[PDB]
Amino acid sequence: SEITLGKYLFERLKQVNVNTVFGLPGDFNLSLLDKIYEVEGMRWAGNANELNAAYAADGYARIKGMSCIITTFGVGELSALNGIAGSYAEHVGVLHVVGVPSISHHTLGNGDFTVFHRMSANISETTAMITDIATAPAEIDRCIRTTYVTQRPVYLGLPANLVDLNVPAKLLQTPIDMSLKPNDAESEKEVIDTILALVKDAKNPVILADACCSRHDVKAETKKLIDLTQFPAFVTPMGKGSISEQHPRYGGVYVGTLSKPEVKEAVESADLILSVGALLSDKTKNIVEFHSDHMKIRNATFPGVQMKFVLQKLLTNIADAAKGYKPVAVPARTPANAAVPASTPLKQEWMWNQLGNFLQEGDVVIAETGTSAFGINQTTFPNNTYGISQVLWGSIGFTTGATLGAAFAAEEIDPKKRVILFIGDGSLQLTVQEISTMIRWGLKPYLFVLNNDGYTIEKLIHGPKAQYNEIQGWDHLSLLPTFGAKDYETHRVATTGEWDKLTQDKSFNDNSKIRMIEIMLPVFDAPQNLVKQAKLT
């Protein structure tokens, strides 16, 4: 019994729970594409562009675990590189499948069929050009396993002839191994023992969860490590959402010198740091760095000890190792907004603080690079909030495509999960078309547009009234109907009373339809942290 290699692929993605496929049709992938519709439960999004399709595959991967985008040779694959590069930089598992010319137009005119391939290799964890149907199955399995486990994009070139070539159906009965290989027994024990020893003598331990605590599936574990030790817990901007914020031991968002003094104080105060961190983007010497494929304890490095299994194993013992810890007070949460007359103009500072009152458990919150990304660090999330902020890549326009991906993924996990976006008016312009795809599928994201007339974050760094920091003023509330939305809602908010009246409304709170909210704000208005950050940069 046999199946086409083109259907093998889609069957493998169904087994890994990639049910939606991103990308655009083109000359070299039509026969692949046809196979999606033969796989019950699969769907082709129909993106408005390849860049947008990649931003989307990122959004989807962030939520569901992995994603797949399919493009066509030359023209499709090159348009998507900015998305791909960003998933590499932030450790998002995206499988980029490119439909290429059959073994032997949309070329550079020099007979070089490997150039686009070479370009991609610089931003892929691994790459594969399928040449033989004999190894082909094993190559797809490999690419899929690797995208999953390293959480990095992988490139797979598939010649048009092969797609319709047959393979043994039987191969689908054995699942792809999607799990981490166990740790070296001995090094793993030494790490565990050393950490336990350190916890025993620390008087003021602190936990700090960054990017990779989320990106590398360790949130249930970090979460329980806090309950078992009662140590103060801080998150960085990229890790925001990694830790439940209504946890009585959550201390806030640590952003170094830019940290609200007590946070700065409580963190720099520690005699022990358990960093379920990330990069060396930049107290004591007593730091434990937890990393996806290695540990570091003070100056000691332990290559290939995976944090997943050390964390799991520490949970069985840590409590008795910390039986002796006297709980230090955690910095108080920022107080609620003092009541004001309904006619008070909306200001960012008041907004970000007030937003914690509309959010709910299970929401997915996306903030674009600009004032939005700075502001969101000032909002307190209900527990179980998934935040998306591209702090490291910082490619504006990313959130519209990502919102599409997260809504698709969220629709699949639970139809009640709300997807909320905060996007600058300047950023929207780069990827606005993707809204069209939201409409087509009946997804219902909350799209909040920050109308402040131009590039505020840029104006705050350089050239406040410079022509290049200014944009063409669009009629945003007409966007929905222009893209053929039938059932949607549009709102404009400019004061605190409009903010409250709208966000406390019962009906508004249910994701029953797609909605756009235009936020009227002053030009030089920004959250305290951007006011204080960028000022210096």
Ligand X SMILES: Cc1ncc(C[n+]2csc(CCOP(=O)(O)OP(=O)(O)O)c2C)c(N)n1
Q: Which residues are catalytic?
A: 27, 50, 105-106, 394, 425, 452, 454, 458
Q: Per CB under 6 A, which region of 37-45, 267-275, 413-421, 453-461 contacts ligand X?
A: 453-461
SS3 46: coil
293 is in an annotated binding site: no
Residue 122 vs 284, nearer CB to a second copy: 122
The tokens describing 383, both together, are 């527990």
| Sheet with 514-520: strands ordered across | 386-388, 364-367, 419-424, 446-451, 514-520, 488-493
Q: Which stretch binds ligand X (CB under 6 A): 19-27, 40-48, 216-224, 478-486?
A: 19-27
Give the nearest residue (CB) to ligand X: 424
CA–CA distance, 259 with 267 (Å, rounded to integer)? 10
Contact call for residue 424 and Mg ion (CB under 5 A): yes
Q: Which of helix, strand or coil describes residue 235?
A: strand
**Choice between 197 and 279, CB closer to a second copy:** 279
Residue 372 near which of a second copy, ligand X, Mg ion, none (CB within 5-8 Å, type-dependent): ligand X
Tell me, what amino acid is at 474?
Answer: W
* Residue 88 interacts with, from Mg ion, a second copy, ligand X, none (CB under 5-8 Å by kind): a second copy
State the residues that interact with a second copy by CB under 8 A: 25, 30-31, 33-34, 37, 44, 46, 48-51, 74-75, 78-79, 81-82, 85-86, 88-90, 105-109, 115, 118-119, 122-123, 279, 392-397, 429-433, 436-437, 439-440, 455, 458, 461-463, 466-475, 478-479, 481-484
Give min distance, CB of 531 to Mg ion, in A.
15
Q: What order do you get walking across the sheet with 94-100 strand by strand? A: 43-44, 20-23, 67-72, 94-100, 154-159, 126-129
Cβ 357 to ligand X shortest distance, Å? 22
CB of 376 to a second copy, least distance (A): 17
Q: Does 426 bind ligand X (CB under 6 A)?
A: yes
Residue with tokens 């892929």: 124
Which position among 47, 244, 372, 496 is part of the footprint of ligand X (CB under 6 A)?
372
Interacting partner of 344 out of Mg ion, a second copy, ligand X, none (Cβ under 5 to 8 A depending on kind): none
- Length, in residues, of the chain: 537
Angstrom distance (rounded) from CA 318 to CA 192: 10
Compute the distance between CA of residue 144 and CA of residue 160 in angstroms, rounded to an integer.
20
Measured from the CB atom, the residue of 328 and 494 that comes closer to ligand X is 494
| 452 in contact with Mg ion (CB under 5 A) | yes
- 25 binds ligand X per the rule CB under 6 A: yes
Per CB under 5 A, 83 contacts Mg ion: no
Q: What is the rounded CA–CA span in Å between residue 214 and residue 206?
A: 18
Q: Given the complex with a second copy, which of 88 and 309 has the nearer CB atom? A: 88
Is residue 426 annotated as involved in ligand binding?
yes
**By CB under 6 A, what part of segment 375-394 binds ligand X?**
394
| Contact predicate 423/455, CB 8 Å | no
**Of the residues 6, 23, 59, 76, which one makes contact with ligand X according to CB under 6 A:** 76
75 binds ligand X (CB under 6 A): yes
Per-position b or e across 286-317, b if 16+ CB within 10 A of its CB = bbbbbbbebbbbeeeebeebbbbbbbebbeee
CB of 102 to a second copy, least distance (A): 12
Q: Mind giving me the DSSP string for 194-208?
A: HHHHHHHH-SSEEEE
Please give the C-alpha separations between residue 384 and each of 44, 179, 363, 438, in angstroms, as whole numbers: 29, 25, 8, 24
| Burial category of 531 from C-beta neighbours within 10 Å (exposed 0-12, middle 13-18, buried 19 and up) | middle
**To the nearest whole angstrom, how small is the minimum distance from the Cβ of residue 301 to a second copy?**
15
Q: Is 420 annotated as contributing to ligand binding?
A: no
- Residue 444: name the closest of 511, 385, 364 by CA: 511
Q: Smallest distance from the beta carbon of 434 to ligand X, in angstroms?
A: 14
Question: 153 in helix, strand or coil?
Answer: coil
Contact between 24 and ligand X per CB under 6 A: yes
Round to whole Å and give the CA distance between 87 and 94. 7
| 186 annotated ligand-binding residue | no
**Is 454 a known ligand-binding residue?**
yes
The residue of the chain with the least Cβ separation from Mg ion equals: 424
Please identify, using beta-carbon distances, which residue of 71 and 244 lies nearer to a second copy.
Answer: 71
426 contacts Mg ion (rule: CB under 5 A): yes
Q: Is 9 helix (H, G, I), strand (E, B) or coil?
A: helix
Q: Which of 371, 389, 496, 533 binds ligand X (CB under 6 A)?
A: 371
Touching Mg ion, residues 264-303 (CB under 5 A): none
Closest approach, Cβ 32 to ligand X, in A, equals: 13
Closest CA to 404 of 22, 2, 18, 147: 22
CB proximity list for 235: less than 8 A, separation 6 or greater: 208, 209, 210, 241, 242, 243, 250, 253, 254
Residue 527 DSSP label = -
Residues that bind Mg ion (CB under 5 A): 424-426, 452, 456
Residues that bind ligand X (CB under 6 A): 24-26, 50, 72, 75-76, 79, 368-372, 394-397, 424-427, 450, 452, 455-458
Which amino acids are annotated as binding site for Mg(2+), given as ranges?
A: 425, 452, 454
Which amino acids are annotated as binding site for pyruvate, given as ranges?
A: 27, 106, 148, 215, 458
